[PDB]
Design a protein around this motif. Structure first.
Motif, PDB file in Angstrom:
ATOM      1  N   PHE A 186      42.915  41.655  31.555  1.00  0.00           N
ATOM      2  CA  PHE A 186      41.774  40.531  31.638  1.00  0.00           C
ATOM      3  C   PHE A 186      41.187  40.310  32.970  1.00  0.00           C
ATOM      4  CE2 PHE A 186      44.586  39.591  27.949  1.00  0.00           C
ATOM      5  CZ  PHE A 186      43.452  39.225  27.049  1.00  0.00           C
ATOM      6  N   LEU A 187      41.972  40.622  34.015  1.00  0.00           N
ATOM      7  CA  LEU A 187      41.198  40.375  35.162  1.00  0.00           C
ATOM      8  C   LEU A 187      40.192  41.615  35.294  1.00  0.00           C
ATOM      9  CD1 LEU A 187      43.953  39.033  37.570  1.00  0.00           C
ATOM     10  CD2 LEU A 187      42.117  37.894  36.699  1.00  0.00           C
ATOM     11  N   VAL A 188      40.531  42.916  35.110  1.00  0.00           N
ATOM     12  CA  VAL A 188      39.460  43.665  35.484  1.00  0.00           C
ATOM     13  C   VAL A 188      38.309  43.662  34.432  1.00  0.00           C
ATOM     14  CG1 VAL A 188      38.915  46.173  34.758  1.00  0.00           C
ATOM     15  CG2 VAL A 188      40.962  45.662  35.870  1.00  0.00           C
ATOM     16  N   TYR A 189      38.459  42.745  33.368  1.00  0.00           N
ATOM     17  CA  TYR A 189      37.263  42.604  32.526  1.00  0.00           C
ATOM     18  C   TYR A 189      36.696  41.092  32.593  1.00  0.00           C
ATOM     19  CZ  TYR A 189      38.526  46.961  30.088  1.00  0.00           C
ATOM     20  OH  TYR A 189      38.661  48.061  29.711  1.00  0.00           O
ATOM     21  N   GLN A 190      37.171  40.382  33.830  1.00  0.00           N
ATOM     22  CA  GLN A 190      36.801  38.945  33.745  1.00  0.00           C
ATOM     23  C   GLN A 190      35.245  38.825  33.813  1.00  0.00           C
ATOM     24  OE1 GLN A 190      36.280  36.469  37.058  1.00  0.00           O
ATOM     25  NE2 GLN A 190      38.100  35.184  36.860  1.00  0.00           N
ATOM     26  N   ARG A 191      34.286  39.900  34.394  1.00  0.00           N
ATOM     27  CA  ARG A 191      33.009  39.619  34.619  1.00  0.00           C
ATOM     28  C   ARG A 191      32.510  39.705  32.973  1.00  0.00           C
ATOM     29  NH1 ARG A 191      31.615  45.364  37.304  1.00  0.00           N
ATOM     30  NH2 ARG A 191      32.366  46.808  35.971  1.00  0.00           N
ATOM     31  N   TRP A 192      33.078  40.079  31.934  1.00  0.00           N
ATOM     32  CA  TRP A 192      32.520  40.240  30.638  1.00  0.00           C
ATOM     33  C   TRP A 192      32.932  38.534  30.040  1.00  0.00           C
ATOM     34  CZ3 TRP A 192      28.620  42.974  30.897  1.00  0.00           C
ATOM     35  CH2 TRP A 192      29.073  44.021  31.889  1.00  0.00           C
ATOM     36  N   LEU A 193      34.099  37.994  30.527  1.00  0.00           N
ATOM     37  CA  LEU A 193      34.391  36.745  29.964  1.00  0.00           C
ATOM     38  C   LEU A 193      33.439  35.636  30.529  1.00  0.00           C
ATOM     39  CD1 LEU A 193      38.039  36.577  30.246  1.00  0.00           C
ATOM     40  CD2 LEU A 193      37.112  36.363  28.173  1.00  0.00           C
ATOM     41  N   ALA A 194      33.000  36.020  31.916  1.00  0.00           N
ATOM     42  CA  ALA A 194      31.838  35.101  32.480  1.00  0.00           C
ATOM     43  C   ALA A 194      30.684  35.113  31.900  1.00  0.00           C
ATOM     44  CB  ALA A 194      31.641  35.868  33.853  1.00  0.00           C
ATOM     45  N   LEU A 195      30.197  36.253  31.381  1.00  0.00           N
ATOM     46  CA  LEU A 195      28.832  36.300  30.651  1.00  0.00           C
ATOM     47  C   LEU A 195      28.963  35.771  29.258  1.00  0.00           C
ATOM     48  CD1 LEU A 195      27.468  39.863  31.819  1.00  0.00           C
ATOM     49  CD2 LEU A 195      26.901  37.691  32.400  1.00  0.00           C
ATOM     50  N   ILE A 196      30.105  35.835  28.553  1.00  0.00           N
ATOM     51  CA  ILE A 196      30.298  35.306  27.133  1.00  0.00           C
ATOM     52  C   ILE A 196      30.182  33.643  27.488  1.00  0.00           C
ATOM     53  CG2 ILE A 196      32.150  34.609  25.682  1.00  0.00           C
ATOM     54  CD1 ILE A 196      33.099  37.568  26.014  1.00  0.00           C
ATOM     55  N   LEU A 235      48.167  38.678  42.600  1.00  0.00           N
ATOM     56  CA  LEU A 235      47.176  37.873  41.634  1.00  0.00           C
ATOM     57  C   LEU A 235      45.924  37.254  42.293  1.00  0.00           C
ATOM     58  CD1 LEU A 235      48.514  37.094  38.905  1.00  0.00           C
ATOM     59  CD2 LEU A 235      48.078  34.903  39.534  1.00  0.00           C
ATOM     60  N   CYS A 236      46.223  36.733  43.479  1.00  0.00           N
ATOM     61  CA  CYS A 236      44.859  35.839  44.148  1.00  0.00           C
ATOM     62  C   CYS A 236      44.072  37.206  44.731  1.00  0.00           C
ATOM     63  CB  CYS A 236      45.603  35.739  45.476  1.00  0.00           C
ATOM     64  SG  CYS A 236      44.492  34.649  46.756  1.00  0.00           S
ATOM     65  N   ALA A 237      44.449  38.279  44.788  1.00  0.00           N
ATOM     66  CA  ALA A 237      43.555  39.668  45.079  1.00  0.00           C
ATOM     67  C   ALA A 237      42.841  40.124  44.009  1.00  0.00           C
ATOM     68  CB  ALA A 237      44.379  40.703  45.692  1.00  0.00           C
ATOM     69  N   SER A 238      43.634  39.869  42.870  1.00  0.00           N
ATOM     70  CA  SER A 238      43.027  40.406  41.615  1.00  0.00           C
ATOM     71  C   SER A 238      41.773  39.490  41.309  1.00  0.00           C
ATOM     72  CB  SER A 238      44.215  40.146  40.553  1.00  0.00           C
ATOM     73  OG  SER A 238      45.216  41.378  40.798  1.00  0.00           O
ATOM     74  N   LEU A 239      41.872  38.261  41.442  1.00  0.00           N
ATOM     75  CA  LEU A 239      41.091  37.248  41.096  1.00  0.00           C
ATOM     76  C   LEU A 239      39.770  37.239  42.075  1.00  0.00           C
ATOM     77  CD1 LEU A 239      40.401  34.537  39.553  1.00  0.00           C
ATOM     78  CD2 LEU A 239      41.219  33.585  41.627  1.00  0.00           C
ATOM     79  N   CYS A 240      40.127  37.497  43.431  1.00  0.00           N
ATOM     80  CA  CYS A 240      39.159  38.001  44.097  1.00  0.00           C
ATOM     81  C   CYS A 240      38.300  39.262  43.854  1.00  0.00           C
ATOM     82  CB  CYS A 240      39.749  38.083  45.595  1.00  0.00           C
ATOM     83  SG  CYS A 240      39.977  36.511  46.417  1.00  0.00           S
ATOM     84  N   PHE A 241      38.852  40.245  43.414  1.00  0.00           N
ATOM     85  CA  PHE A 241      38.183  41.312  42.786  1.00  0.00           C
ATOM     86  C   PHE A 241      37.550  41.009  41.859  1.00  0.00           C
ATOM     87  CE2 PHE A 241      40.275  44.079  45.926  1.00  0.00           C
ATOM     88  CZ  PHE A 241      40.160  45.426  45.395  1.00  0.00           C
ATOM     89  N   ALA A 242      37.884  40.254  40.810  1.00  0.00           N
ATOM     90  CA  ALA A 242      37.229  39.783  39.547  1.00  0.00           C
ATOM     91  C   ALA A 242      36.025  39.215  40.037  1.00  0.00           C
ATOM     92  CB  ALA A 242      38.054  39.058  38.706  1.00  0.00           C
ATOM     93  N   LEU A 243      35.880  38.330  40.764  1.00  0.00           N
ATOM     94  CA  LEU A 243      34.816  37.512  41.266  1.00  0.00           C
ATOM     95  C   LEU A 243      33.707  38.228  42.083  1.00  0.00           C
ATOM     96  CD1 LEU A 243      36.512  34.221  42.342  1.00  0.00           C
ATOM     97  CD2 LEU A 243      35.357  34.761  40.140  1.00  0.00           C
ATOM     98  N   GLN A 244      33.959  39.448  42.369  1.00  0.00           N
ATOM     99  CA  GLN A 244      33.187  40.149  43.075  1.00  0.00           C
ATOM    100  C   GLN A 244      32.485  41.462  42.371  1.00  0.00           C
ATOM    101  OE1 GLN A 244      34.587  41.111  47.311  1.00  0.00           O
ATOM    102  NE2 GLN A 244      36.189  40.129  46.332  1.00  0.00           N
ATOM    103  N   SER A 245      33.048  41.326  41.179  1.00  0.00           N
ATOM    104  CA  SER A 245      32.495  42.483  40.248  1.00  0.00           C
ATOM    105  C   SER A 245      31.332  42.310  39.343  1.00  0.00           C
ATOM    106  CB  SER A 245      33.673  42.893  39.466  1.00  0.00           C
ATOM    107  OG  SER A 245      34.012  41.860  38.473  1.00  0.00           O
ATOM    108  N   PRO A 246      31.099  41.052  39.063  1.00  0.00           N
ATOM    109  CA  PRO A 246      29.885  40.922  38.072  1.00  0.00           C
ATOM    110  C   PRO A 246      28.520  41.603  38.987  1.00  0.00           C
ATOM    111  CG  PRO A 246      30.825  38.551  38.676  1.00  0.00           C
ATOM    112  CD  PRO A 246      31.282  39.803  39.427  1.00  0.00           C
ATOM    113  N   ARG A 247      27.792  42.034  37.930  1.00  0.00           N
ATOM    114  CA  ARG A 247      26.338  42.413  38.506  1.00  0.00           C
ATOM    115  C   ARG A 247      25.393  41.361  38.688  1.00  0.00           C
ATOM    116  NH1 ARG A 247      28.647  47.028  34.854  1.00  0.00           N
ATOM    117  NH2 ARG A 247      29.484  48.519  36.137  1.00  0.00           N
TER     118      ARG A 247
END
Length: 620
Positions: A92-102, A166-178
């Protein structure tokens, strides 16, 4: 296995949420998110039905899609029975940027309304602070739905302490959107680039972080405004080097001795996104050809490289391996067998295997160029090749700059360049149309605030035509909302369009303004092709400074090049307000235009310069 078990299907997702089948629902959910990911936001290959009214209304059809997904996600994730595995969270975290956009393209904006259901302390000072259970399960679900557009509060120090992966994971997710463009989002990202590097530096490897968007954290940080914005790369290389020693049992090469092919020392070039119609090729292939004067050139790439790009090298191969590990060893085996002298990456950042190789020793001399215009902060990369014209400050780079003459990197002309013109020199402009060529990553709060001021303080009426390269499917309504929040009816956000339709939008403009801090290069050639003129902001990073380099090359006058946000606003007000000046400036460009000078030059220097370094090293 049974038939159709993996088709991303909005209705099946909805049926599993309603059925309370929580594990079916999360899996049907992930089918859809991974497809969004493969489509880069598009909604092709994701089966769903829609009211007849939405037939030729693509945008609306998109927002419908997002709102159905949002409401299903809501009823699923609000349910306190739902547990997500420890493997599931990574997905879920790898794909967070697609929940963001949803959520961000639906009317919901974010997912705080689910986050609020996870709160347990009913009497609170801060209504935006979420007092969780003490279940790790509840912490997981909060992180999955902590979206860039969230208004709820976040303490990273607290979370790091509780669970660092977990915190790192979320950090990565937050930096991933285009698209990290709205203030809410850009501010989350900004604080993260100040806070997170010293923490990522603590990790032993990439086993429990979303590692498949690692290139994304690598690249995306360039699009921030702070001076130390690149620190996360430094921290990231250290984790990567750790990762590759322990997990891949990596032994570097011995670079004391070198070998030869047809009496010339070898240059091994690791490629990414190198096809002849794209811009890495257009900016660099010529200096790479010319280096064949002194070096035997072995290209290593993906099958994305067409005939033309393979032909720049003497020898070209695919990078082999199932795993990052075998890909590295293949790269090693080529440098080993040939005893490479130079290891060279004209672009680094776009692909992960390029970032892995830059944490590695494979030839005596290792250099990148600026396909992606940002220092690596890697201790294994000695040099950066760059056009002298284009560097502001040398301190922006941990590597040592190898500053080439300004005609040293001759461009290849895109085959899509029109052969004719039809210059539109509007004498009576009621409205002064202003074009912006931009990707979604270039969009920020600072850039848009600047355009607001231009619109507000200008005695003439203006309209902004945004030609976006990035705005696909579910990305687009949100980027549309973003831009509307600053300019309302003085702006048009055109969706991604092919070259011709794109030239057609700029062509109905009177002037252009260029994004910052990350400038343009293509946009500028386009602007000059259409005999249009505009304003850019300069600055200390190369990617801030290219616009200045290129204006000067194109004969543009130096007052078009602003140094501060304040000037930039003011200079655009001048050029939009002063009709006659504008016009004459246009006619000057139509008539005296340095475009010619980009497509030629002496591409020999890069080869010369490297030879000099190698010979110097050979005396040891």
């Amino acid at each position: 296995t049974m038939e159709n078990e993996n088709k991303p299907n909005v209705a099946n997702f909805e049926a599993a949420v309603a059925a309370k089948d929580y594990e079916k629902a999360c899996s049907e959910l992930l089918l859809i998110l991974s497809q969004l990911d493969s489509n880069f936001g598009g909604i092709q290959e994701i089966e769903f039905e829609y009211p007849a009214q939405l037939q030729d209304l693509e945008q609306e059809k998109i927002v419908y899609f997002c709102t159905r997904m949002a409401t299903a996600i809501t009823t699923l994730f609000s349910d306190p029975v739902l547990e997500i595995s420890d493997l599931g969270v990574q997905r879920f975290l790898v794909y967070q940027r697609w929940l963001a956009l949803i959520f961000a393209s639906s009317p919901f904006v974010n997912a705080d309304h689910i986050l609020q259901t996870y709160n347990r302390e009913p009497n609170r000072k801060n209504s935006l602070e979420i007092h969780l259970d003490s279940s790790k399960s509840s912490l997981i679900k909060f992180c999955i739905l902590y979206l860039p557009e969230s208004n709820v509060n976040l303490n990273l120090d607290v979370m790091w302490n509780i669970s660092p992966e977990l915190c790192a994971s979320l950090c990565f997710a937050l930096q991933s959107p285009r698209f990290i463009g709205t203030s809410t989002a850009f501010n989350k990202r900004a604080t993260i680039l100040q806070w997170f590097p010293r923490h990522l530096d603590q990790l032993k490897n990439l086993n429990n972080i979303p590692s498949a968007i690692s290139h994304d954290v690598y690249m995306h940080c360039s699009y921030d405004t702070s001076v130390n914005k690149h620190d996360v790369k430094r921290a990231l290389n250290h984790v990567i080097r750790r990762h590759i020693e322990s997990e891949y049992g990596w032994k570097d090469r011995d670079v004391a001795h070198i070998g030869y092919r047809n009496n010339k020392p070898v240059m091994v070039v690791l490629l990414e996104h190198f096809h002849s119609a794209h811009s890495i090729y257009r900016t660099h292939s010529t200096s790479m050809i010319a280096a064949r004067e002194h070096f035997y050139l072995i290209g290593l790439g993906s099958p994305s490289v067409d005939q033309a790009g393979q032909e720049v090298f003497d020898e070209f191969h695919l990078v082999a391996g199932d795993n990052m590990k075998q890909k590295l060893e293949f790269i090693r085996s080529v440098c080993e067998s040939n005893g490479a002298a130079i290891f060279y990456m004209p672009s680094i950042g776009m692909d992960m295997t390029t970032i892995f190789a830059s944490n590695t020793r494979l030839a005596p001399i290792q250099a990148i160029a600026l396909g992606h215009p940002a220092t690596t902060h890697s201790d294994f990369i000695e040099y950066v090749i760059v056009e002298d014209d284009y560097v502001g400050s040398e301190e922006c780079f941990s590597e040592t700059l190898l500053r080439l003459p300004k005609d040293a990197l001759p461009y290849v002309p895109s085959a899509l360049a029109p052969e004719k013109v039809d210059y539109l020199l509007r004498e009576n402009p009621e409205v002064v149309n202003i074009g912006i060529a931009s990707t979604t990553m270039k969009l920020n709060p600072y850039f848009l605030e600047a355009l607001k001021a231009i619109r507000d303080r200008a005695k003439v009426k203006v309209h902004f035509h945004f030609a976006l390269g990035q705005s696909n499917g579910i990305t687009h309504p949100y980027v549309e909302r973003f831009i509307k929040s600053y300019l309302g009816d003085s702006a048009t956000a055109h969706p991604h369009s092919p070259y011709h339709q794109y030239l057609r939008i700029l062509h109905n403009c009177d002037m252009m303004v260029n994004p910052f801090p990350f400038g343009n290069t293509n946009g500028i050639i386009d602007m000059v092709t259409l005999g249009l003129v505009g304003v850019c902001k300069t600055g200390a990073e190369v990617h801030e400074h290219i616009d200045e380099g290129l204006f000067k090359r194109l004969g543009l006058p130096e007052w078009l090049i602003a140094n501060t946000v304040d000037e930039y606003v003011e200079r655009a007000v001048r050029l939009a307000e002063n009709h006659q000046e504008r016009l004459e400036l246009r006619r000057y460009i139509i008539e005296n235009n340095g475009l010619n000078t980009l497509f030629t030059g002496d591409p020999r220097p890069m080869g010369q310069v490297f030879l000099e370094k190698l010979n110097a090293f050979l005396k040891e």
